[PDB]
Design a protein around this ligand. Structure first.
Ligand SMILES: OC[C@H]1O[C@H](O[C@H]2[C@H](O)[C@@H](O)[C@@H](O[C@H]3[C@H](O)[C@@H](O)[C@@H](O[C@H]4[C@H](O)[C@@H](O)[C@@H](O[C@H]5[C@H](O)[C@@H](O)[C@H](O)O[C@@H]5CO)O[C@@H]4CO)O[C@@H]3CO)O[C@@H]2CO)[C@H](O)[C@@H](O)[C@@H]1O
Ligand SMILES: OC[C@H]1O[C@H](O[C@H]2[C@H](O)[C@@H](O)[C@@H](O[C@H]3[C@H](O)[C@@H](O)[C@@H](O)O[C@@H]3CO)O[C@@H]2CO)[C@H](O)[C@@H](O)[C@@H]1O
Ligand SMILES: OC[C@H]1O[C@H](O[C@H]2[C@H](O)[C@@H](O)[C@@H](O)O[C@@H]2CO)[C@H](O)[C@@H](O)[C@@H]1O
Ligand SMILES: [Ca+2]
Ligand SMILES: [Ca+2]
Length: 686
């Protein structure tokens, strides 16, 4: 099938995600509605169940609400069974309507529906070319008190009805008992409780295996993608091993949530997205968009800096999931603000690089403060809104104009309030003009583009006061006036002749796994696929077409490879880097080195004989290691993803900048478990 097919679980770049709070969307089956003080059909009390369910979602798919909008994917709340207890906070009754308080990852939340309702959801969706994404929060269970075991469900964890354990009397050590995080450090927010949520111990084989098995069930249920909750709160090493479990089984688009604040730029964030085997929700993008379009705390020069910076920081920028708001922030639209602010932000998001995500209700100009004011019930299903028509006109461009889905981004004109960018991919072009100034028009002159000679109509049809564009020779555009609050989209599409790689997924897996290569101009006849210098052809290429190729990963040594294709004629394409080949199936192992004294600013890293350890390359060493929570300096620790059952040689190193100090003596050795976890405790060798 084509790259734009609904069957494409590896690529969402051409889609438009619609984030749905199940409970707050549509109650299609009143029979499964929670009763008593846990329910509020009037949805006046936003901390209780309102009745939203999967059936309701199906109804909205079948009636044309979502399809008419141009939405090609839906991201729903966590489907797993949540606690049934009504948590009373200082007089405020609280329920697990959000689905974030898991009690059993192998069962569904009855309020949402049964397993059969879920299966029906997948079918109905797929039938309308809509992909299904599920929220997955394996960082914790529920709110618990080690003190008062009577509080909530004591964060109890069940395995398909079978009680595994609780936060109180945790003899098995399923959870972390390190207190609560203050978000002070990364390590602090990782090994300590997120709020009062019972923190899961991923270093426990039981938890490790259980979680990896739970997801496999969902995978089997036909999901097309996963949104990983609180990724900055779980060990990176375990998550990688988790991604490998998914990838080496049934690959699906996965993106996690790594909360970033205003003007917050984390290098840890970048590394995670680049090496974890999963992408992230673009918090850098969302925050900046809000500054520029919402609060006006930054200008177009800031938006531009964000675009060009992110493009350099993310190996796969096109994989980052963009948004303007969500269930954890104030809704973009302020009740007293000009709607044109939201419309423009929408238009910008839909035409920018990455994977656009729209928080349900946006199209309806919903306003609301922080949680839970931002999670009100959708007030209507009207298609007559401007924001609705905007998405409806721009959404589809992601499927018909590859420049928007995989294209580069280039600034072609800029000032405080105006921004004109160009998206380009192969013989495809898209030019977007935005004027955030709602009071003053802008005189556009000297604009140059990649558009062919001719006249271009505004894709938005003037909806946002857009205009036509006249392009002469050299793509030089005729002088024009950009109206206040004006937004215009111009484009040009044409068949690509040369093989052009626009996307790859999964980005990490072991040999034998089938990956997906999307782009243009691959030809209809099988060509050759290159993993570094290794050529692949014939049978291993399970599928080949102009826009998509399906090939199995060759049995090459573990490492980082550049992907490249060639058509039947021998014409090579562009390179697609950062593709990681695993040494095999993965396990999560905790490494511990004792008596490793360092100087302030100097950290300890881990290196080893496997690609998962950097193959003895200090530039690729694991770390910096931790030394606060679980173990304390001069004791360091770190959870790493390593090939299972493999006998690995390793050493530790002290690094300051690029300067390296090796551990003395001989290499440490050990055989990775074939399953579950392990803990390697060693002493620094002088
Ligand atoms: O802001 C967070 C912080 O976290 C990480 O810091 C790393 C360091 O980069 C690593 O070096 C390591 O730190 C170790 C030191 O290596 C080790 O020597 C020891 O440090 C002692 C010092 O010996 C002592 O002099 C004391 O220094 C003073 C400073 O002189 C003063 O300027 C400052 O105001 O206060 C300190 C505290 O008195 O500091 C400690 C006292 O025990 O112990 C630490 C381990 O804690 O590991 C940490 C991670 O925990 C990031 O790498 C770093 O960039 C970031 O700044
Ligand atoms: O050239 C191939 C070489 O590769 C591998 O050697 C690695 C060592 O096993 C490993 O210990 C590490 O060596 C460092 C020492 O530990 C340290 O004391 C000091 O001597 O620096 C060394 C790094 O230069 O890294 C090397 C790889 O560079 C393999 O195991 C060897 O058999 C082989 O000779
Ligand atoms: O003419 C090419 C030129 O176009 C753009 O420059 C704009 C600039 O952004 C405006 O602020 C204003 O000064 O008009 C210029 C047109 O002359 C691009 O920004 C620039 O890179 C490019 O060279
Ligand atoms: Ca219901
Ligand atoms: Ca945690």
């Amino acid at each position: 099938a084509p790259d734009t097919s609904v069957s494409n679980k590896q690529n969402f770049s051409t889609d438009v995600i619609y984030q749905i709070f199940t409970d707050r969307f549509s109650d299609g089956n009143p029979a499964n509605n929670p009763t008593g003080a846990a329910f509020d059909g009037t949805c006046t009390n936003l901390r209780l169940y309102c009745g939203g369910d999967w059936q309701g979602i199906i109804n909205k798919i079948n009636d044309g609400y979502l399809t008419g909008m141009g939405v090609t994917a839906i991201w729903i709340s966590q489907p797993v069974e949540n606690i049934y207890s009504i948590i009373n906070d200082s007089g405020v009754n609280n329920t697990a309507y959000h689905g974030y308080w898991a009690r059993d990852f192998k069962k569904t939340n009855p309020a949402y529906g049964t397993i059969a309702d879920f299966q029906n959801l997948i079918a109905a969706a797929h039938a309308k070319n809509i992909k299904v994404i599920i929220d997955f929060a394996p960082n914790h269970t529920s709110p618990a008190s080690p003190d008062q075991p009577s509080f909530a469900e004591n964060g109890r964890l069940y395995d398909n009805g079978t009680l595994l354990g609780g936060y109180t009397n945790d003899t098995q050590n399923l959870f972390h008992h390190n207190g609560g995080t203050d978000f002070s450090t990364t390590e602090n927010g990782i090994y300590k409780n997120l709020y009062d949520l019972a923190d899961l111990n991923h270093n426990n084989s039981t938890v490790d295996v259980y979680l990896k098995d739970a997801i496999k069930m969902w995978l089997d249920l036909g999901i097309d993608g996963i949104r990983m909750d609180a990724v900055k709160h779980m060990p990176f090493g375990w998550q990688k091993s988790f991604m490998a479990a998914v990838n080496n089984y049934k690959p699906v688009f996965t993106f996690g949530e790594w909360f970033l604040g205003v003007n917050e730029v984390s290098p840890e964030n970048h590394k995670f997205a680049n090496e974890s085997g999963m992408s992230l929700l673009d918090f850098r993008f969302a925050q900046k968009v809000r500054q520029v379009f919402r609060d006006n705390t930054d200008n177009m020069y800031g938006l531009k800096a964000m675009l060009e910076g992110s493009a350099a920081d993310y190996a796969q920028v096109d994989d980052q999931v963009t948004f303007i708001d969500n269930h954890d922030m104030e809704r973009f639209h302020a009740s007293n603000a000009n709607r044109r602010k939201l419309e423009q932000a929408l238009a910008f998001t839909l035409t920018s690089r990455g994977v656009p995500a729209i928080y349900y209700g946006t199209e309806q100009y919903m306003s609301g403060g922080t949680d839970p004011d931002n999670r009100a019930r959708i007030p209507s299903f009207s298609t007559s809104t401007t924001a609705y028509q905007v998405i409806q006109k721009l959404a589809p461009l992601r499927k018909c104009n590859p420049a928007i889905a995989y294209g580069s981004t280039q600034e072609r004109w800029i000032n405080n309030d105006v921004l004109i960018y160009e998206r380009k991919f192969g013989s495809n072009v898209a030019v977007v003009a935005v004027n955030r100034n709602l009071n003053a028009p802008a005189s556009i002159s000297g604009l140059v583009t990649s558009l062919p000679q001719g006249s271009y109509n505004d894709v938005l049809g003037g909806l946002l006061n857009g205009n036509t564009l006249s392009v002469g020779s050299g793509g030089a555009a005729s002088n024009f006036t950009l109206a206040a609050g004006g937004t215009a989209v111009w484009q040009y599409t044409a068949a690509t002749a040369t093989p052009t790689i626009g996307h790859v997924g999964p980005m990490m897996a072991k040999p034998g796994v089938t990956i997906t290569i999307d782009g243009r101009g691959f030809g209809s006849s099988k060509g050759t696929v290159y993993f570094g210098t290794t050529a692949v052809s014939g049978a291993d290429i399970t599928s080949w077409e102009d826009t998509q190729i399906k090939v199995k990963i060759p049995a090459v040594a573990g490492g980082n490879y550049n992907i490249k294709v060639a058509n039947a004629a021998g014409t090579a394409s562009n390179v697609y880097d950062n593709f990681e080949v695993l040494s095999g199936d993965q396990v999560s192992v905790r490494f511990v080195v004792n008596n490793a004294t360092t100087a302030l600013g100097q950290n300890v890293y881990l290196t080893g004989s496997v690609s998962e350890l950097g193959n003895w390359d200090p530039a690729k060493a694991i770390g910096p290691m931790y030394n606060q929570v679980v173990y304390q300096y001069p004791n360091w620790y770190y959870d790493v993803s390593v090939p299972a059952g493999k006998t690995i040689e390793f050493k530790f190193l002290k690094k300051q900048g690029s300067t390296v100090t090796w551990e003395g003596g001989s290499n440490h050795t050990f055989t990775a478990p074939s399953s579950g976890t392990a803990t390697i405790n060693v002493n620094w060798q002088p």
